[PDB]
Design a protein around this ligand. Structure first.
Ligand SMILES: CCCCCCCCCCCCCCCC(=O)OC[C@H](COP(=O)(O)OCCN)OC(=O)CCCCCCCCCCCCCCC
Ligand code: NA
Length: 166
């Protein structure tokens, strides 16, 4: 995992660290390690084919928008984190989940010419876990304040209005 991590900067590594800690808290260390590796693998591949120009920046638009939508809805729901129960926030969290499903599909479409079918399934499983409404509701109801959802959302919500990759 050394090289994959030196292929993304400190900012991204901190984002992935926050996600990984939350995943640890909601499931287990094995799933957290698998999801960290999967996120790194998908990211590294996308960046690789952007840089080699096998993928054009315009082709990324669909994923970009979807991700930002997802982030935005999480930000909206995070406004009520600690003052409303997750059941009262499903209408927001569902939209986040749906947005990430869109990102999932488009990432699959983006990487089909370059990923073996097993790694396409890896994309599906990774996005399905990270974008799961069950994951979100568990996070919004059952986390301690020390689990630092604030760090993740407060890092994500800076990116909702500007293209993620340009
Ligand atoms: C698994 C998802 C894979 C999606 C792959 C396709 C889309 C890729 C686009 C990624 C853009 C991210 C930029 C962010 C800033 C940054 O960190 O930017 C540094 C590098 C890129 O920098 P650059 O030099 O390219 O700059 C670009 C031009 N300025 O980004 C990264 O390290 C990616 C880090 C991603 C970590 C995501 C973790 C959360 C995702 C799921 C949400 C789960 C919520 C859980 C709620 C409890
Ligand atoms: Na796209």
């Amino acid at each position: 995992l050394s090289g994959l991590k030196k292929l993304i900067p400190e900012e991204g590594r901190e984002l992935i660290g926050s996600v990984k800690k939350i995943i640890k808290r909601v499931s287990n260390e094995e799933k957290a390690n698998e999801m960290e590796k999967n996120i790194l693998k998908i990211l590294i591949k996308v960046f690789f084919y952007i840089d080699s120009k096998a993928i054009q920046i315009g082709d990324l638009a669909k994923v970009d928008r979807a991700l930002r939508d997802g982030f935005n809805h999480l930000d909206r729901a995070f406004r009520y984190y600690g003052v409303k129960k997750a059941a009262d926030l499903v209408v927001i969290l569902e939209k986040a989940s749906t947005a990430l499903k869109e990102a999932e599909q488009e990432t699959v479409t983006l990487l089909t010419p370059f990923f073996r079918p097993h790694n396409i399934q890896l994309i599906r499983n990774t996005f399905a876990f990270l974008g799961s409404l069950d994951f979100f509701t568990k996070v919004w109801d059952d986390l301690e304040i020390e689990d630092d959802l604030f760090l993740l959302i407060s890092a994500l919500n800076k990116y909702t209005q500007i293209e993620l990759i340009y």
